[PDB]
Structure 1
């Protein structure tokens, strides 16, 4: 038993809710919140900009030190950093950004990072400003992640569509 509430169960291990991931994180305080990161951990907009804003820019300060030490992430890769006031940990995962021409097949590699964590609160990778089809992203999530994932979808219209088209 865990503290996630109002989710619709899609599969054995994948759940989905129309929710603002920032507000869901602040309420649940999950062990892991997933950020929709880029390779530079520049949290300017989308989910990343919202998560970082909610930490009063502490996420960005920590991220800049991480990059100065380690260099950029790989597309499809991840790193674990602090969850600040939102979660114990933040798993920064880089989905391919279609608006940069990145290979969509890397979306499966991105979701594989979730399997290193027993339970996660996450957005749909490569959705939103990353330019992928959220329905494809949901399919890859379901077919790749084996651990327990609670998907927060900000847009109510999109949430309903994703549900109504789910196979």
Structure 2
């Protein structure tokens, strides 16, 4: 049993809810919240900007030190950093950004990072301002992630479309 509430069960391991990942993280304090990161960990907008704003910019300060030491992530890659006030850990995952021309096949590699964690609160990778089709992102998530993932979908209209169209 875990603390996640109000989710619709899609599969054995994937759950979905219309919720802001920031408000959900604040309520649950999950072991792992996933950030929709870019390779530079520049948390300007979308999930990354809202998460970072909720940490009072502490996520960005930590991220800048990580990049200064390690250099940029790979598209499809990830790193584990602090969850600050939102979670124990933040798994920063880089899905391909279609609005930068990145290979959508890298979305499966991105979701494979989730398998290193038993339970996660996450957004749909490469959705929103990353430009991918969220229906596609949910299909790759279900077909790739084997650990227990609780997906937060901010947009109520999109949530309803994801549920209604789910095979």
Shorter chain as normaliser: what TM range?
A: over 0.9
**TM-score when scaled to structure 2?**
1.00
The alignment partner of 2:125 has SS state of: coil
Shift of 1:90: 0.0
Q: What do residues 7-49 of structure 1 show as CA deviations (whole Å, max 9, x unaligned)?
A: 0000000000000000000000000000000000000000000
In 2, Cα distance between the equivalents of 1:2 and 1:46? 27
In 2, Cα distance between the equivalents of 1:162 and 1:54? 27
In 1, Cα distance between the equivalents of 2:140 and 2:85? 30
Shift of 1:117: 0.0
Q: What do residues 66-119 of structure 1 show as CA deviations (whole Å, max 9, x unaligned)?
A: 000000000000000000000000000000000000000000000000000000
In 1, Cα distance between the equivalents of 2:45 and 2:114? 22
Shift of 1:124: 0.0
Unmatched tracts of structure 1, length 5 or more? none
In 1, Cα distance between the equivalents of 2:3 and 2:35? 20
Q: What do residues 121-167 of structure 1 show as CA deviations (whole Å, max 9, x unaligned)?
A: 00000000000000000000000000000000000000000000000
Unmatched tracts of structure 2, length 5 or more? none
**TM-score when scaled to structure 1?**
1.00
Superposed CA RMSD in Å reads: 0.1
Number of equivalenced pairs: 167
In 1, Cα distance between the equivalents of 2:49 and 2:65? 17
In 1, Cα distance between the equivalents of 2:50 and 2:129? 13
In 2, Cα distance between the equivalents of 1:15 and 1:61? 32
In 2, Cα distance between the equivalents of 1:98 and 1:46? 15
